[PDB]
Design a protein around this nucleic acid. Structure first.
Ligand SMILES: [Mg+2]
Ligand SMILES: [Zn+2]
Lengths: 105, 104, 170, 221, 7, 1112, 14, 111
DNA sequence: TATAATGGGAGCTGTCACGGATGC
DNA sequence: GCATCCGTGAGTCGAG
């Protein structure tokens, strides 16, 4: 439901050392499948910290208790020498299709 | 093969056509006189006769020796509404304009 | 009949031929002012040339120019070359021009007008609609019905008053 | 020609010059007439150009200053290979001239533009069609002033006749002018101190009622 | 450019 | 994925550079790379050579010129609202004839706009395109006299603004007449001026008996060249004194003066070829050794008489023939205006030469560059041919640069434009596209240059063909004009070939446009490709041969309007032209040489080439185009990747891996759906929004100025009167909204305060003031706010101030602030979608996925298109596209199907068979047999005669699948559609017409000054026009009060509209209307015409509508 | 017709 | 009274002068420095009326209480500014000039 | 304020059909 | 009586 990236003010921006723009990064993060174990848990903020050269995958997210990524091979970003990516991505429970415009989270 | 919008406008503006048909100003009987070089059609009443000189290639709507009404077309083509007015009067012109416009 | 000659040329009220400061502080104005200025310059020069006892050729030229000035004012381009502003080929817009034509006063502002409480948008098929109905977008309606909406907002607790409701819809 | 006046106008003004030259001529000097005439002719033509050429008229000395500024800037641009800044023009104009003076001189020199200026490749759009009227009050503004007056009356009706009338006199709701204390005091037949006091208590009651009903708050923007 | 809106 | 391509036709040559028509033209005009002494007599050099030398004794002469480097780069010019340009210096020398004194200096003439690499210009920060003009080529023409048959008109036409058209006609009275500047005079007079003796004219024109007798006039031959000259001068100039030198001057300037009278080089050539003569200069005559000598006149007269007589080898001219119509490109137009400005500069020079001091005059003092500068600037700003560049997608720019216009200066006006000039002439073949033109008033007047078409040095459009000798087709390619093409028999490009030899007993060819069946012995030439017949746009329509031309036009035009999508994809069915378009448009970034990629970044790609050098390419990122479409480049390569020459480094807008991507490939079913696709409306799946199909980025620019006033300065600040901190929340310290903030209508982008207009507070305001005890502030809130219906994220702020380095604004302006706001637009209801075949529609409904028709395997369709749009429209290309699209869906491949050399039904059937195996056999292995619903649908289709009886369910399903039809399930029921439905992949684009831009509404708002009627347009918050016809509608309904409201209460009745608004907010019914203000304006404007207009009552007594305010 | 021409004529008289 | 008929007719010089609230003797529009209207110019408040509601040019009388009052100093009537779209001015010609409508419209009415 | 100077300068050319006013 | 001149017309929103 949300993405914060360090030194990124909005979706329309690019990051030094990263091939993908933020629109593409979010497009990739939109394919992320996150399984919750505990039924009581509404939301999780996945923390990611990485630097290049490397190809950052969904597996690179720091593990959380009772949280399983069902697609660790999912591509996130392409990082280059000097390229640095720091993200906090909010994943929520929910139903149906709720556009970014509507929830504004 | 339709005349269309310019025909409609021709009628509504009451314009004298360049396609203009020649009409009889009076009643009478048709006497056609055609030299190979030149063609003419006469309309003969009891009192007096009138002469219409037209190009030899014009299509005649008349058979020789026929009695024609005043304003009746001698030749094909659209009728000049004003000529039809002076000849056959207002009702004739109203009928003509209405029917003509409706054709299109 | 002699009233078809002008001894005294009327002058339109200034608000109908405005001199207005636009957004950037620059000035924009009607051509009628330039026409009137030509007229007044030539007339004044005529009075001074008369008072000073000028030769006949000069006075003749001046009078001719005065008539042509009046012509340009009333109907421009009617007789002779149309008067244009310096550094432009655009004819100045005279009173006749203002009145007639598709852009003229009658057709543009009189037989038709731009109106309030109006809007426009793209159309989309209505298959669920009953014959007497149309789908109207919410926001369009909010704007079109706006005063009614202020009133109804005041009729309820939605706003203390009309102005509060409007400031709320801002 | 091309200086803002028609050929015929230049000719006529030049003719005025010719007349001046005729009345001022001295044949004793043995100079031909054309020599003395030319001076006055050029004089009249140039005076005409300076006086008539602008929809917004500018004094002749100021027109001279503006044209001088133009020539200065043009020479400066001719040696600079580009349009000069305000500072460079100010330098070339001499002492007394700074960037601000050049800038304001260029500002006052600006000529108006036509309202009939065409917009778009068609003939159907005037530049003046995009210009709103700021003078006449909008329906919203008018209605707001109306509701304001009605509400002010509503509030003044919670006072008495005298204090409401004193307030209407002092604030100018009656004849539109604002009366002094001595005028309302001589009108109601009391001291200026007294009328000032009843004005004070009037305003005070209005303040209390306003804090109470919050009715006149929204008209304060 | 007009007709039914190509351009 | 695999790209399979069809067609047997091998194109010998590739497409020429598509922007060359702009680039080479302007380059030719400037000659910047050519050292001055090597320059030719063409271009701006030509203009210099025509203007100079300037005489009358001082003489100013022209040595050479030079163009400096641009003071600023293109980008910086775009941001600072500058013009990309180079300084133009001219080396001049003043020579006093008597003194012998020569003063030489290089003077600065100002700047000239430089054309960019892609063939566009930057004028005041905005990209513009100079559109090529088409017109009648100069020369000597012979046309039938419309009135009198047997008689002809000989017209001598020079270049535009190059001097008068001259007509020659044989009059009913027998004498030959000449028309110049609307003056009819006997030609024999001018003939005498040229010094023609009656004997020479007799021996020359004697071959034609009747006519030359009509030429003979003894009163003319009794004169002398001088006397005849002065006679002609008196004829052309009534009242003007007939001085000898003045007559010589006038006639020379009218005919022999090269500076006043110019036939083009093309006019020269055409005159020479037509009249069978040789021209010395470009004029109709010369002044040599003191007298005049004839060039064009006698040959013209000879030809005219010969045509009138019936002499063989003399024909009239087709003025619409593309041999007689040429093109004026950027270079010629710009050069023309340059010539004009130069002429003005020259006038000024002669002025100063007469007036200035005789002892010291430098060229610098003589030359005022201003008029020239003005001419150039005027051309690049206010010209009709100088157009705002269309950058919507790269193809839009590319196509815009290739446009041809019959309009503009020296061109047609739409009133003078009849059917003939708007026709598709046979000669348009290979030159001007028969397909792509506007639908409306400009139809046939605005056209497009064909793909292989080229404009020669003379300005004639040439198309390539191939030499055919003895039935053998060479690789030699020859570009001919229409005149040259008329001389040959040219075979079609599809004539069967074995090797380089034509094998058919009969071949289809053209002779002067006429289709003819000839033997291979008769074939002189052969077409390069079907592509050459159409434009770049039309060439992007696959299965074009299956589409009626009328819809091809629409598909063509609409591709221009395609919005770049974030997810944009190349078509599943391409034409083969998709890459060249991307390349030529300079949209994509490519590798310069063979090399290795050093660095890859969102902002940068660094490549190391064979030279060992490190070349860094910055990527344009989220830049706003003229149309507000986002133009951004994304890297398509990776670190360490080896790249050969011409390899793709980065994709620009609307480009997927180097292929043009104008839209999405979506899965369509062609069926009616519950009236939601009624009348071209379109139904889409919400699944398209979910996966961000048809989502596009748009950037809008807002601008505010703070200037010095007489009431005190405006200023940009965070301190805004009567505003809470909630409103200033996103405003920075200086008062400008901060980057990254989200703005909605009503939000402040930039805070600004302005000193109040002088006013005495109304007693209401004073009393309220005293009551609340708050001092009235002397400044008010002028801040720039987000207009209604707009908003987004602020991606940029630009702040320029007076007193800042490198910054100087227009006088009085203290500071300027711009705010760039980006918005991500999802597809929504009312947005315009279209395919390449002319099928356009607005999205009327977005269903959730469960409501969508779906395949038996559970796959929902993306889009539902109504079949009712097909038959009347006759564009079947979209159907074929769908069928093939189906195959490539299951085979997972894309196709290239060249126009007129295509994929054919049987091949598509094969692919559909393979695809069917993929689509079905999978199911059969998965342990599922044929469905009951499938059985029912099979029975239905069996009744329709779609499948053969007796075959197994699988066999029949395959039979349907080969017809491109599949069983489809209703998502709402689960019961199948009774018939099998056509389903497949189609390429659909989101057009620039978006309801978000078009939706507008107003209650009240700004009014006009004079008329007091509402302003027009969304941007002005204007009212809709209720025009004469809307009024007629209300009259026809007999609704008098609705109408009267339109005319009064809702528009120009001041008291009425005010009282109406107040009445409505109060809840009262609206008050009775009053006099509309514009009627008062009418009365007062008629008074200014000295006509008294009086409103009267039934007593014939005056009524005052001005209520005493106008009467003393 | 042309005022300038006309005036130049009237001038050309004297 | 209710408007019934509308008449149009020639205007006599006397009528035209009766319309006029003053003669415009100068081509001037507004002053370059002040941006106020110039005396005896096309925009003059003395002739065509006040620019501001119930306020004269010099600012001697700023209020509605004075109505029809004319300032002695600036000569400007205090009234509604709306009248600036209503009140006509005039220009007295030295030589009478023909109205081109009654000349150039064929057949010429004067002719 | 004084040598003498003495008739301008672009046109813009591919519609059309009418109606009504002058000219053989 | 009939050629030829001149003047005047030549679609609607929308945006620019
Ligand atoms: Mg200085
Ligand atoms: Zn005063």
């Amino acid at each position: 439901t949300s993405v914060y990236i360090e030194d990124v003010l909005h979706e329309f921006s690019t990051i030094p050392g990263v091939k993908e723009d933020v629109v593409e990064i979010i497009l990739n993060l939109k394919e992320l499948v996150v399984r919750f174990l505990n039924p009581s848990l509404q939301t999780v903020t996945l923390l990611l910290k990485a630097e290049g050269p490397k190809e950052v995958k969904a597996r690179d997210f720091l593990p959380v208790a009772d949280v399983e990524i069902m697609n660790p091979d999912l591509h996130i970003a392409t990082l280059e020498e000097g390229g640095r990516l720091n993200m906090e991505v909010r994943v929520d429970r929910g139903v149906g299709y709720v556009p970014a415009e509507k929830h504004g989270i | 093969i339709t005349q269309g919008l310019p025909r409609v406008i021709e009628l509504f503006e009451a314009r004298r056509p360049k396609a203009k048909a020649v009409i009889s100003e009076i009643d009478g009987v048709v006497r056609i006189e055609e030299t190979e070089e030149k063609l003419s059609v006469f309309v003969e009443s009891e009192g007096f006769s009138k002469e219409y000189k037209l190009p030899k290639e014009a299509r005649l709507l008349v058979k020789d020796g026929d009695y024609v009404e005043a304003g009746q077309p001698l030749t094909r083509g659209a009728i000049d509404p004003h000529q039809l007015l002076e000849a056959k009067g207002p009702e004739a012109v109203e009928r003509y304009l209405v029917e003509e416009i409706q054709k299109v | 009949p002699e009233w078809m000659i002008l001894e005294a040329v009327p002058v339109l009220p200034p608000d109908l031929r405005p001199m207005v400061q636009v957004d950037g502080g620059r000035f924009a104005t009607s051509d009628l002012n330039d026409l009137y200025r030509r007229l007044i310059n030539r007339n004044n020069r005529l009075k001074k040339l008369l008072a000073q006892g000028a030769p006949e050729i000069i006075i003749r030229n001046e009078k001719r120019m005065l008539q042509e000035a009046v012509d340009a004012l009333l109907d421009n381009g009617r007789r002779g070359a149309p008067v244009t502003n310096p550094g432009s080929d655009r004819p100045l817009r005279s009173l006749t021009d203002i009145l007639s034509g598709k852009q003229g006063r009658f057709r543009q502002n009189l037989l038709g007008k731009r109106v309030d409480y109006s809007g426009r948008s793209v159309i989309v098929v209505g298959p669920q609609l009953k014959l007497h109905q149309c789908g109207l977008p919410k926001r369009m309606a909010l704007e079109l019905f706006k005063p009614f909406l202020l009133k109804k907002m005041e009729e309820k607790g939605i706003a203390p008053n009309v102005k509060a409701a409007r400031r709320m819809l801002e | 020609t091309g200086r803002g006046l028609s050929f015929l106008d230049l000719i006529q003004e030049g003719n005025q010059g010719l007349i001046r030259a005729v009345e001022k001529f001295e044949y004793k000097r043995r100079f031909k007439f054309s020599t003395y005439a030319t001076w006055w002719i050029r004089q009249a033509i140039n005076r005409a150009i300076a006086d008539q050429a602008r929809t917004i008229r500018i004094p002749v000395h100021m027109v001279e200053t503006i044209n001088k500024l133009s020539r200065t800037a043009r020479q400066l641009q001719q040696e600079l290979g580009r349009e000069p800044t305000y500072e460079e023009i100010a330098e070339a104009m001499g002492p007394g001239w700074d960037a601000k003076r050049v800038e304001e001189t260029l500002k006052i020199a600006q000529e108006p533009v036509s309202l009939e200026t065409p917009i778009g490749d068609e003939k159907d759009s005037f530049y003046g069609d995009f210009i709103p009227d700021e003078h006449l009050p909008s329906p919203v503004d008018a209605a707001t002033q109306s509701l304001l007056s009605e509400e002010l009356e509503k509030a003044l009706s919670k006072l008495s006749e005298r204090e409401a009338m004193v307030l209407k006199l002092r604030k100018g709701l009656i004849d539109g002018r604002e009366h002094t204390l001595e005028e309302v005091g001589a009108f109601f037949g009391v001291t200026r101190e007294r009328i000032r006091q009843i004005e004070n208590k009037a305003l005070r009651k209005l303040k209390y009622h306003e804090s109470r009903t919050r009715k006149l708050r929204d008209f304060l923007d | 450019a007009x007709x039914x809106x190509x351009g | 994925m695999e790209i399979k391509r069809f067609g047997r036709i091998r194109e010998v040559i590739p497409l020429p550079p598509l922007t060359e028509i702009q680039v080479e033209s302007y380059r030719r005009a400037l000659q910047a790379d050519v050292p001055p002494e090597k320059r030719e007599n063409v271009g701006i050099q030509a203009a210099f050579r025509e203007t100079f030398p300037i005489e009358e004794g001082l003489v100013l002469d022209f040595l050479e010129y030079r163009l400096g480097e641009p003071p600023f780069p293109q980008d910086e010019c775009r941001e600072k609202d500058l013009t990309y340009q180079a300084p133009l210096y001219a080396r001049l020398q003043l020579i006093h004839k008597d003194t012998g004194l020569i003063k030489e200096d290089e003077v600065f003439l100002g700047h000239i706009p430089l054309m960019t690499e892609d063939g566009s210009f930057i004028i005041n920060g905005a990209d513009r395109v100079i559109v090529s003009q088409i017109h009648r080529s100069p020369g000597v023409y012979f046309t039938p006299d419309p009135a009198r048959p047997g008689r002809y008109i000989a017209s001598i036409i020079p270049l535009p603004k190059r001097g008068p058209w001259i007509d020659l006609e044989v009059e009913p009275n027998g004498v030959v007449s000449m028309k110049v500047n609307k003056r009819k005079f006997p030609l024999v007079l001018l003939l005498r001026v040229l010094g023609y003796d009656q004997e020479t004219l007799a021996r020359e024109l004697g071959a034609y008996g009747e006519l030359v007798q009509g030429l003979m006039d003894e009163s003319v031959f009794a004169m002398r060249p001088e006397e005849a000259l002065i006679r002609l001068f008196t004829l052309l100039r009534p009242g003007d004194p007939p001085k000898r030198d003045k007559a010589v001057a006038y006639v020379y300037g009218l005919i022999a003066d090269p500076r006043r009278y110019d036939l083009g080089e093309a006019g020269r050539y055409k005159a020479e070829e037509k009249l069978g003569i040789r021209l010395s200069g470009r004029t109709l005559a010369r002044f040599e050794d003191g007298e005049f000598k004839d060039e064009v006149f006698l040959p013209t007269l000879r030809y005219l008489f010969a045509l009138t007589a019936g002499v063989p080898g003399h024909e009239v001219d087709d003025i619409d023939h593309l041999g007689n119509r040429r093109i004026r490109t950027v270079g010629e137009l710009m050069t023309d205006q340059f010539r004009v400005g130069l002429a003005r500069l020259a006038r000024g020079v002669r002025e100063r030469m007469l007036m200035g001091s005789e002892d010291s005059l430098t060229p610098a003092k003589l030359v005022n560059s201003r008029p020239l500068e003005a001419a150039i600037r005027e051309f690049f700003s206010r010209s009709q041919l100088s157009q705002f560049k269309d950058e919507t997608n790269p193809l839009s720019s590319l196509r815009h640069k290739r446009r041809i216009s019959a309009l503009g200066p020296g061109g047609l006006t739409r009133e003078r434009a009849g059917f003939d000039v708007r026709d598709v002439h046979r000669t348009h073949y290979g030159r001007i596209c028969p397909v792509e033109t506007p639908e409306g008033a400009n139809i046939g007047l605005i056209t497009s240059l064909a793909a292989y078409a080229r404009v020669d040095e003379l300005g004639f459009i040439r198309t390539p063909y191939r030499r055919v000798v003895g039935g053998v087709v060479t690789d030699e390619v020859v570009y001919m004009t229409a005149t040259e093409e008329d001389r040959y028999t040219i075979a079609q490009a599809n004539t069967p070939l074995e090797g380089n030899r034509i094998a058919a007993e009969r071949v289809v060819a053209r002779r002067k446009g006429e289709p003819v069946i000839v033997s291979p012995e008769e074939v002189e030439f052969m077409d390069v490709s079907p592509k050459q017949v159409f434009s770049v746009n039309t060439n992007l329509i696959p299965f074009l041969e299956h589409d009626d031309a009328n819809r091809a036009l629409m598909g063509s035009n609409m591709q221009t309007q395609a919005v770049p999508l974030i997810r944009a994809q190349a078509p599943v069915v391409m034409t083969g032209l998709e890459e060249r378009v991307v390349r030529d448009s300079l949209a994509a970034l490519y590798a310069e040489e063979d090399g290795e990629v050093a660095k890859v970044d969102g902002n940068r790609i660094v490549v190391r080439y064979e030279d060992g050098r490190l070349v860094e390419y910055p990527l344009r990122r989220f830049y706003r185009s003229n149309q507000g479409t986002a133009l951004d480049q994304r890297p398509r390569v990776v670190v360490g990747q080896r790249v050969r020459k011409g390899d793709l480094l980065a994709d620009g807008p609307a480009s997927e891996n180097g292929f043009l991507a104008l839209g999405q490939n979506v899965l369509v079913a062609i069926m009616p759906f519950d009236g939601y696709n009624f009348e071209d409306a379109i139904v889409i799946s919400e699944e398209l929004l979910k996966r961000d199909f048809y989502t596009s980025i748009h950037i809008e620019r807002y601008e505010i100025e703070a200037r010095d006033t007489k009431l005190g300065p405006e200023r940009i600040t965070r301190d805004i009167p009567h505003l809470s901190e909630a409103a200033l929340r996103d405003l920075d310290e200086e008062g400008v909204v901060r980057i990254g903030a989200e703005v909605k209508p009503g939000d402040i982008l930039v805070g600004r305060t302005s000193f109040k207009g002088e006013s005495e507070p109304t007693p209401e305001e004073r009393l309220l003031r005293s009551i609340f005890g708050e001092k009235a502030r002397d400044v008010k809130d002028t801040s720039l706010r987000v207009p209604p219906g707009e908003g987004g994220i602020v991606v940029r702020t630009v702040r320029l101030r007076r007193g800042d380095p490198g910054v100087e604004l227009k006088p009085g302006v203290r500071e300027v602030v711009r705010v760039y706001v980006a918005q991500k637009r999802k597809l929504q209801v009312g947005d315009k979608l279209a395919n390449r075949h002319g099928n356009k529609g607005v999205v009327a409904k977005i269903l959730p996925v469960e409501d969508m028709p779906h395949l038996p395997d559970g796959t929902p369709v993306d889009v539902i298109l109504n079949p009712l749009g097909v038959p009347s429209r006759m564009n079947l290309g979209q159907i074929l596209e769908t069928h093939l699209g189906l195959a490539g869906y299951f085979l997972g491949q894309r196709y290239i199907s060249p126009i007129f050399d295509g994929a054919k039904e049987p091949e598509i059937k094969e692919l559909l068979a393979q695809a069917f195996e993929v689509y079905f056999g999978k199911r059969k292995g998965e342990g599922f047999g044929v469905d009951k619903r499938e059985v029912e649908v099979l029975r239905r289709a069996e009744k329709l005669g779609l499948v053969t009886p007796g075959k197994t369910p699988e066999e029949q399903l395959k039979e349907l699948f080969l017809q491109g039809k599949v069983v489809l399930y209703d998502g709402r029921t689960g019961e199948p559609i009774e018939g099998p439905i056509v389903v497949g992949q189609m390429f659909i684009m989101k057009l620039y017409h978006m309801v978000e831009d078009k939706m507008h509404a107003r209650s009240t708002g700004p009014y006009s000054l004079i008329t007091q009627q509402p302003l027009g347009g969304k941007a002005q918050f204007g009212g809709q026009r209720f025009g004469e016809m809307e009024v007629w509608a209300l009259e026809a309904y007999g609704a008098a009060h609705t109408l009267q409201e339109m005319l009064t209460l809702k528009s120009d009745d001041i008291e009425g509209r005010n009282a109406a608004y107040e009445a409505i907010i109060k809840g009262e019914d609206v008050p009775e209307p009053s006099v509309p203000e514009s009627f008062r304006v009418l009365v007062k404007e008629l008074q200014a015409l000295a006509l008294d207009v009086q409103t009267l009552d039934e007593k014939d007594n005056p009524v005052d509508i001005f209520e005493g305010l106008a009467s003393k | 017709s042309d005022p300038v021409r006309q005036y130049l004529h009237e001038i050309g008289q004297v | 009274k209710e408007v019934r008929k509308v008449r149009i007719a020639l205007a006599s010089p006397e009528k035209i002068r009766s319309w006029s609230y003053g003669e415009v003797e100068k081509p001037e529009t507004i002053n370059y420095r002040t941006l106020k209207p110039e005396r005896d110019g096309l925009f003059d408040e003395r002739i065509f009326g006040p620019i501001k509601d119930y306020e004269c040019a010099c600012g001697k009388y700023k209020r509605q209480r004075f109505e029809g009052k004319v300032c002695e100093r600036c000569g400007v009537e205090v009234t509604k500014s709306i009248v600036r779209r209503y009140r006509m001015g005039h220009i007295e010609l030295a030589t009478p000039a023909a109205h081109i409508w009654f000349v150039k419209d064929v057949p010429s009415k004067i002719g």
